[PDB]
Design a protein around this ligand. Structure first.
Ligand SMILES: *[C@@H]1O[C@H](CO)[C@@H](O[C@@H]2O[C@H](CO)[C@@H](O[C@@H]3O[C@H](CO[C@H]4O[C@H](CO)[C@@H](O)[C@H](O)[C@@H]4O)[C@@H](O)[C@H](O[C@H]4O[C@H](CO)[C@@H](O)[C@H](O)[C@@H]4O[C@H]4O[C@H](CO)[C@@H](O)[C@H](O)[C@@H]4O)[C@@H]3O)[C@H](O)[C@H]2NC(C)=O)[C@H](O)[C@H]1NC(C)=O
Ligand SMILES: *[C@@H]1O[C@H](CO[C@@H]2O[C@@H](C)[C@@H](O)[C@@H](O)[C@@H]2O)[C@@H](O[C@@H]2O[C@H](CO)[C@@H](O)[C@H](O)[C@H]2NC(C)=O)[C@H](O)[C@H]1NC(C)=O
Ligand SMILES: *[C@@H]1O[C@H](CO[C@@H]2O[C@@H](C)[C@@H](O)[C@@H](O)[C@@H]2O)[C@@H](O[C@@H]2O[C@H](CO)[C@@H](O)[C@H](O)[C@H]2NC(C)=O)[C@H](O)[C@H]1NC(C)=O
Ligand SMILES: *[C@@H]1O[C@H](CO[C@@H]2O[C@@H](C)[C@@H](O)[C@@H](O)[C@@H]2O)[C@@H](O[C@@H]2O[C@H](CO)[C@@H](O)[C@H](O)[C@H]2NC(C)=O)[C@H](O)[C@H]1NC(C)=O
Ligand SMILES: *[C@@H]1O[C@H](CO)[C@@H](O[C@@H]2O[C@H](CO)[C@@H](O)[C@H](O)[C@H]2NC(C)=O)[C@H](O)[C@H]1NC(C)=O
Ligand SMILES: *[C@@H]1O[C@H](CO)[C@@H](O[C@@H]2O[C@H](CO)[C@@H](O)[C@H](O)[C@H]2NC(C)=O)[C@H](O)[C@H]1NC(C)=O
Ligand SMILES: *[C@@H]1O[C@H](CO)[C@@H](O[C@@H]2O[C@H](CO)[C@@H](O)[C@H](O)[C@H]2NC(C)=O)[C@H](O)[C@H]1NC(C)=O
Ligand SMILES: *[C@@H]1O[C@H](CO)[C@@H](O[C@@H]2O[C@H](CO)[C@@H](O)[C@H](O)[C@H]2NC(C)=O)[C@H](O)[C@H]1NC(C)=O
Ligand SMILES: *[C@@H]1O[C@H](CO)[C@@H](O[C@@H]2O[C@H](CO)[C@@H](O)[C@H](O)[C@H]2NC(C)=O)[C@H](O)[C@H]1NC(C)=O
Ligand SMILES: *[C@@H]1O[C@H](CO)[C@@H](O[C@@H]2O[C@H](CO)[C@@H](O)[C@H](O)[C@H]2NC(C)=O)[C@H](O)[C@H]1NC(C)=O
Ligand SMILES: *[C@@H]1O[C@H](CO)[C@@H](O[C@@H]2O[C@H](CO)[C@@H](O)[C@H](O)[C@H]2NC(C)=O)[C@H](O)[C@H]1NC(C)=O
Ligand SMILES: *[C@@H]1O[C@H](CO)[C@@H](O[C@@H]2O[C@H](CO)[C@@H](O)[C@H](O)[C@H]2NC(C)=O)[C@H](O)[C@H]1NC(C)=O
Ligand SMILES: *[C@@H]1O[C@H](CO)[C@@H](O[C@@H]2O[C@H](CO)[C@@H](O)[C@H](O)[C@H]2NC(C)=O)[C@H](O)[C@H]1NC(C)=O
Ligand SMILES: *[C@@H]1O[C@H](CO)[C@@H](O[C@@H]2O[C@H](CO)[C@@H](O)[C@H](O)[C@H]2NC(C)=O)[C@H](O)[C@H]1NC(C)=O
Ligand SMILES: *[C@@H]1O[C@H](CO)[C@@H](O)[C@H](O)[C@H]1NC(C)=O
Ligand SMILES: *[C@@H]1O[C@H](CO)[C@@H](O)[C@H](O)[C@H]1NC(C)=O
Ligand SMILES: *[C@@H]1O[C@H](CO)[C@@H](O)[C@H](O)[C@H]1NC(C)=O
Ligand SMILES: *[C@@H]1O[C@H](CO)[C@@H](O)[C@H](O)[C@H]1NC(C)=O
Ligand SMILES: *[C@@H]1O[C@H](CO)[C@@H](O)[C@H](O)[C@H]1NC(C)=O
Ligand SMILES: *[C@@H]1O[C@H](CO)[C@@H](O)[C@H](O)[C@H]1NC(C)=O
Ligand SMILES: *[C@@H]1O[C@H](CO)[C@@H](O)[C@H](O)[C@H]1NC(C)=O
Ligand SMILES: *[C@@H]1O[C@H](CO)[C@@H](O)[C@H](O)[C@H]1NC(C)=O
Ligand SMILES: *[C@@H]1O[C@H](CO)[C@@H](O)[C@H](O)[C@H]1NC(C)=O
Ligand SMILES: *[C@@H]1O[C@H](CO)[C@@H](O)[C@H](O)[C@H]1NC(C)=O
Ligand SMILES: *[C@@H]1O[C@H](CO)[C@@H](O)[C@H](O)[C@H]1NC(C)=O
Ligand SMILES: *[C@@H]1O[C@H](CO)[C@@H](O)[C@H](O)[C@H]1NC(C)=O
Lengths: 132, 120, 441, 132, 132
């Protein structure tokens, strides 16, 4: 908790340097909870949900071939229709909150393409003469 | 079952290029990988030249021939060919068209009769 | 000499039979108990997947989905009554008369006018009140002194006059890691393999309707009358008959009732049955004769299929025992009817009016120890329902092929769910597996 | 949910192309659950179990050296006694359900060998002249 | 459970050979739990905690760049002030329990350095002429 959100106003490029700050903070009595068994449930539900959300994101990175990475490259080309901007307009002079608002509607298109790309890559690994 | 049929000049003069064409029957070049050329050099034996992926146009070549060899595919004719830049007497060999299937599940060859080419 | 190396696959489409807990889901659109315990909506367009080339073994008699409905239904009944008024103070000696004003002879002796001493909201004060009772719930002490029928056996509580128990179609859905498979094949026996199957997220909507002898408001077969049983040969087992044509049944309670609210304690009200307005008549159900005496003919041809080609089939009345066993227990409008079905099973193969009784103190089949008092309904009621299947019991098995006798049977609450959960099986998905390939690290 | 089990009748080879379809579907009120605290537990138990099953499979892939992969190679040889069939009898003209029934009894033998192989591989990585 | 703690008295070096024995054992009625809804909670709390502890350790290995490994190298130099001993005094003639007691106070210093190292490594991967 030394920047949980310190990069929020930074540009997209600059904010790429705090990815471990946000990730490490996303998976952070005695008798009362059992004597009054309403609160034991209220507390467990909050804990179970934090775990399920964490795992769903990890499963996607696994499927897309980005497991274990905070920054990962793929082979899906960027469609100009998703955002008609060049790199100097995206990485500089723009925040991640603004970018998310701009892309939002295309999130599922992009995710579907990332999954298709990884499956094609695996198919090419079961053919010993691949990519030649 | 794939059949491989080859033709081209059996005689090339020194400093002239060499050109051999392999016709493919029974399947589509554009669908499979592993289309390749191998030659049998007298006094040496069999040597790999290179191969092409009919699905992409990407190729790989034996380093000793990278400066001279071109492999390409005719997707209309369903034939592929080997071209070699200027050749010398040292390139006299029996040249062959072959198809190599090698995956996690199956292994097999299709290997045609070849063309005898003399350089002189 | 194959020289292969155990590769590992994850995400392999392999499944095994399993028992898990299913969750309920609804249509959203639906003070009804099942509108509250079935909150999660289903998808409006369920993602059903046909499985090509898959053969799977089913067995409706060993299906644990049935057992879960039994537990869920009785569990909800025992939660809905939790906050409501106990009627313990009414278990007092009653003074009763015969209610002889404006009575049809068929109702003579059916109702009693009982007065009693009960408390008011104050600890030191009493009131004299009276109400009407049905004779089924009033028992003579040692000719005017009567006790409530269950005072020497069980506690009594008042059904909450707010909560509806009208059936709502509900759907059962698999938890993550599980899937439900369904048979779409034809004329399924209820057991054995089916070769036309699909994967679903949830079951179709099933209404938790509970009745005896006749099965109401279910799925109406498809191509023909289908007769299913665990064994058929064993006369200790039931036979479930599912019809492809419904039979309409019209039930009514003709007496126009009113209600009175009696204070039973501070903040606690008791709902008593008041005077009947107009003539007193007996409750009954109407079955069209023109449909019933044909529906059975269809059943008989199919029933003979399992016993012989030239044998006599006889439909007899029910046997002895409690009203829950010997009669058609019918829950409608909020009141409990016990109807006489002898008029439906009185023939040999080779408009029908059924009288009904009404009971208010219900010792539900589910257990012994507590009973529910059902508050009366104001005005009059009418019920319309579909007979979709029958539960028959074979009362023979004797050494005489000449004829065989069938009687109305059943009575187990699960007989009303088994026929809908009939097409479904629960499996667990197991994603790892290994196989040899010609590839090593 | 576009094929949760679509490949069930396909051959083992063909079914290898849907591994992301099955994996992505294996880790998918308001007041009622706290007013009636029987159901809060019934629901949490179902959710906790789905998480525990997921994690046990991930731990095994980790131990065997197959983390992050849907298709993974190992160095354990196949014993002919586990199934005396050639590749053309396994990958073609056979389903995964049939194969699982055939192998079942040998599952633990195979898993034990996969763990031993990875440990031997790690030992060879703490010797800078390894495999020469 | 064939050595859950068999290596406890072994030297640090020898004990490095049982890492899969300890890891595989760290993420191992009917009506009673719902009829008496005190025990349903007591049991769920124990299960949720085992999962949360497992995941926190996995997240750290991810952040430090050691995901999927039981033995992992880093680029953080050892400070002689953390333990002024040579390798022949650490790997031989010393147990892991003794070592943990010796290091304890420096645990957080070391963990902080491991995170900084991985972030520097990632920065160098977004510059195509890196390390030359
Ligand atoms: C097999 O499937 C069939 C078909 O679904 C099913 O039959 C249906 O049963 C339900 C329940 O018994 C019937 O629904 C009732 O219908 C009456 C008819 O009222 C009509 O006329 C009034 C006049 O103003 C209209 O307003 C009304 O819309 C109708 O046109 C309704 O009156 C019932 O509603 C009352 O009772 C409900 C119980 O919870 C209350 O929630 C509701 O608010 C109403 O009560 C109010 O008025 C009362 C009047 O005295 C008052 O006392 C209450 O305090 C409150 O103010 C209800 O809608 C339905 O019609 C049946 N369908 C047919 C074709 O008959 C079978 O039962 C089923 N078989 C099974 C399960 O065995
Ligand atoms: C870039 O994407 C377009 C399609 O995107 C459209 O808008 C999205 C929000 C979503 O609604 C999509 O479904 C829309 O189609 C691609 O153009 C499509 O290409 C296919 C190819 O056959 C064609 O059938 C579609 O009709 C095209 N759509 C339109 C509107 O013409 C385009 O090719 C993509 N470019 C790249 C480089 O991927
Ligand atoms: C293939 O496996 C056999 C052993 O498998 C047998 O059957 C299994 C179901 C299980 O019961 C095993 O425990 C059985 O042993 C290997 O043969 C064994 O090799 C060891 C080596 O010393 C020997 O001591 C055993 O007696 C042998 N078993 C028998 C029955 O003779 C065989 O070597 C394995 N082959 C490969 C390539 O791994
Ligand atoms: C090894 O670590 C020392 C510092 O460790 C000290 O003791 C620790 C328990 C903890 O209290 C630390 O905060 C302490 O500082 C390093 O020495 C420091 O180097 C910085 C560099 O500018 C200097 O400002 C500090 O004053 C130094 N500390 C002292 C006590 O002089 C030393 O450089 C480290 N060596 C290596 C190789 O990393
Ligand atoms: C908030 O915005 C200001 C400017 O709008 C940012 O300041 C700039 O920071 C860059 C960093 O190198 C400097 O080169 C610019 O000259 C600064 N601008 C001005 C006007 O001084 C500031 O950094 C922003 N805050 C965050 C968190 O990004
Ligand atoms: C992303 O979705 C939003 C809505 O969720 C789109 O904005 C709407 O676009 C329609 C188009 O006729 C307008 O009528 C709405 O008023 C818009 N809503 C708002 C809040 O402005 C948005 O355009 C979509 N973006 C893209 C790129 O398709
Ligand atoms: C049930 O008994 C009560 C009396 O215990 C009857 O109520 C009385 O009816 C007469 C008729 O004129 C009235 O004058 C009395 O004032 C009523 N008494 C009370 C206390 O209300 C009641 O009618 C009887 N009900 C039936 C159906 O016979
Ligand atoms: C499995 O059963 C389904 C029944 O729902 C069959 O689907 C029907 O097939 C006929 C063939 O002409 C179509 O006309 C119907 O419209 C289909 N029904 C539906 C609901 O789409 C299906 O063909 C059967 N499959 C097998 C292998 O017998
Ligand atoms: C129905 O149940 C009866 C009773 O168990 C089965 O018949 C008996 O099967 C045992 C099997 O060893 C025989 O020893 C008995 O002699 C059989 N009883 C008679 C009267 O022959 C019967 O087979 C079952 N039928 C079905 C269709 O399940
Ligand atoms: C259902 O109704 C039938 C007739 O409507 C009742 O049958 C009568 O039972 C008595 C008992 O001995 C016989 O003496 C009568 O002759 C029977 N009538 C007929 C027409 O057979 C039957 O008891 C009623 N069932 C119940 C449960 O009340
Ligand atoms: C179900 O089985 C049939 C055949 O038993 C499969 O059909 C074969 O599909 C392959 C695919 O290339 C064809 O080459 C064969 O000629 C087909 N056979 C026939 C007789 O047409 C069908 O694909 C199987 N279904 C699944 C899901 O695998
Ligand atoms: C895998 O285990 C099954 C049992 O779980 C084995 O099948 C049994 O083998 C014994 C051997 O005498 C028979 O008596 C049983 O009747 C068999 N059971 C069944 C259901 O057939 C099976 O043989 C084992 N497979 C291998 C390869 O060992
Ligand atoms: C417990 O301590 C004894 C000695 O203090 C260990 O025995 C030594 O084991 C090594 C292993 O190669 C031998 O070379 C030594 O000669 C042994 N020493 C003696 C005196 O025999 C023993 O292994 C220790 N136990 C554990 C679990 O490490
Ligand atoms: C690690 O921490 C322990 C305490 O948690 C340190 O031991 C204490 O050191 C102070 C120093 O004045 C002593 O007064 C205490 O009595 C010591 N406690 C014990 C239990 O001995 C220990 O020195 C620290 N280690 C390092 C390397 O800093
Ligand atoms: C009272 O009810 C009983 C019920 O059997 C009946 O026999 C008796 O004749 C009734 N008394 C009067 C006055 O009708
Ligand atoms: C109420 O109590 C009085 C006390 O004497 C008794 O006479 C009367 O009959 C009781 N009433 C009823 C209906 O039992
Ligand atoms: C209650 O009394 C009735 C009177 O006939 C009797 O039949 C019944 O068995 C009794 N119940 C118990 C539990 O004793
Ligand atoms: C009774 O059967 C008819 C036949 O079509 C059907 O339309 C009606 O909805 C059914 N009623 C019930 C309650 O299912
Ligand atoms: C019901 O099944 C019988 C069986 O012969 C058939 O004749 C009748 O037409 C079927 N009814 C319907 C509605 O299909
Ligand atoms: C249907 O069930 C009966 C009762 O056990 C059985 O004898 C018969 O063989 C079954 N039919 C099929 C097709 O399984
Ligand atoms: C049953 O039919 C009789 C015939 O007269 C009729 O009077 C009665 O009202 C009908 N009952 C119902 C429930 O329709
Ligand atoms: C039930 O009531 C409806 C009301 O219109 C009537 O049409 C139908 O024929 C009745 N059914 C019977 C069995 O009398
Ligand atoms: C019984 O009657 C049916 C009617 O078609 C016939 O097909 C069947 O073979 C008959 N069975 C015997 C045993 O005669
Ligand atoms: C059975 O049918 C006969 C036919 O006349 C009739 O007399 C008898 O009363 C009927 N039995 C019942 C219980 O309705
Ligand atoms: C009525 O039932 C008898 C039973 O044997 C049957 O013979 C008669 O044909 C049935 N009536 C009609 C209209 O089918
Ligand atoms: C009961 O009788 C009252 C008397 O006026 C009438 O208003 C009411 O509508 C009747 N209720 C019925 C027949 O449901």
């Amino acid at each position: 908790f030394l920047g949980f959100l310190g990069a929020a106003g930074s540009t997209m490029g600059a904010a790429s340097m705090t990815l471990t700050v946000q990730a490490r903070n996303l998976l952070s009595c005695q008798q009362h909870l059992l004597k009054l068994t309403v609160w034991g449930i209220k507390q467990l539900q909050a804990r179970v949900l934090a775990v399920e959300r964490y795992l769903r994101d990890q499963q996607l990175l696994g499927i897309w071939g980005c497991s274990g990475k905070l920054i990962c490259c793929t082979n899906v080309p960027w469609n100009s229709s998703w955002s008609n901007r060049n790199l100097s307009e995206i990485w500089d002079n723009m925040t991640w909150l603004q970018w998310d608002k701009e892309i939002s509607n295309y999130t599922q298109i992009i995710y579907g393409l990332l999954e298709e790309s990884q499956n094609q890559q695996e198919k090419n690994e079961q053919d010993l003469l691949a990519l030649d | 079952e794939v059949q491989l049929v080859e033709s081209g000049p059996g005689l090339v003069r020194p400093s002239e290029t060499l050109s051999l064409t392999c016709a493919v029957s029974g399947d589509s070049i554009s669908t499979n990988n592993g289309w390749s050329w191998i030659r049998q050099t007298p006094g040496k034996g069999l040597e790999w030249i290179g191969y092409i992926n009919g699905r992409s146009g990407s190729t790989r070549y034996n380093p000793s021939l990278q400066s001279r060899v071109t492999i390409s595919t005719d997707t209309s004719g369903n034939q592929f060919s080997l071209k070699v830049n200027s050749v010398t007497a040292a390139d006299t060999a029996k040249y062959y068209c072959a198809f190599f299937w090698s995956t996690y599940y199956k292994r097999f060859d299709v290997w045609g009769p070849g063309v005898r080419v003399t350089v002189s | 000499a194959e020289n292969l190396w155990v590769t590992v696959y994850y995400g392999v489409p392999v499944w095994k039979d399993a028992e898990t807990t299913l969750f309920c889901a609804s249509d959203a659109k639906a003070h009804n108990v099942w509108a509250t315990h079935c909150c999660v909506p289903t998808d409006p367009n369920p993602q059903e997947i046909h499985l090509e080339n898959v053969t799977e073994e089913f067995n409706m008699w060993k299906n644990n989905m049935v057992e879960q409905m039994h537990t869920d239904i009785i569990s909800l009944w025992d939660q809905s009554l939790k906050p409501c008024v106990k009627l313990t103070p009414l278990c007092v000696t009653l003074q009763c008369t015969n209610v002889t004003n404006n009575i049809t002879d068929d109702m003579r002796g059916e109702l009693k006018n009982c007065s009693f001493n009960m408390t008011t909201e104050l600890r030191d004060k009493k009131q004299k009140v009276y109400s009407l009772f049905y004779r089924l719930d009033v028992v003579q002490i040692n000719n005017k002194e009567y006790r409530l029928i269950n005072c020497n056996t069980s506690a009594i509580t008042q059904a909450c006059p707010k909560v509806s128990f009208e059936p709502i179609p509900i759907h059962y859905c698999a938890p993550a890691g599980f899937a439900i498979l369904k048979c779409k094949d034809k004329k399924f026996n209820g057991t054995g393999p089916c070769t036309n199957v699909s994967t679903v997220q949830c079951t179709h909507g099933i209404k938790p309707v509970v009745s005896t002898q006749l099965l109401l408001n279910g799925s109406l077969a498809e191509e023909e009358v289908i007769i299913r049983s665990e064994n058929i040969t064993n006369n200790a087992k039931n036979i479930l008959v599912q019809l492809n044509e419904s039979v309409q049944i019209n039930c009514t309670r003709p007496n126009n009732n009113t209600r009175k609210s009696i204070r039973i304690g501070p903040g606690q009200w008791f709902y008593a049955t008041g005077d009947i307005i107009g003539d007193i008549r007996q409750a009954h159900c109407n079955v069209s004769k023109a449909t019933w005496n044909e529906t059975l003919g269809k059943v008989v041809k199919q029933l003979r299929k399992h016993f012989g080609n030239n044998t006599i089939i006889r439909f007899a009345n029910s046997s002895g025992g409690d009203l829950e066993v010997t009669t058609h227990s019918f829950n409608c409008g909020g009141e409990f009817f016990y109807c006489n079905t002898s008029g439906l099973f009185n023939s040999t193969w080779i408009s029908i009016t059924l009288p009904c009784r009404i009971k208010q103190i219900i010792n539900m089949w589910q257990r012994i120890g507590q009973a529910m008092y059902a508050p009366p309904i104001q005005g009059v009621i009418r019920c319309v329902s579909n007979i979709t299947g029958l539960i028959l019991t074979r009362d023979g098995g004797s050494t005489n092929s000449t004829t065989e006798t069938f009687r109305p049977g059943g009575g187990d609450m699960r007989d009303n769910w088994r026929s809908e959960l009939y097409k479904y099986k629960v499996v667990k998905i197991e994603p790892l597996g290994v196989a040899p390939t010609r590839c090593k690290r």
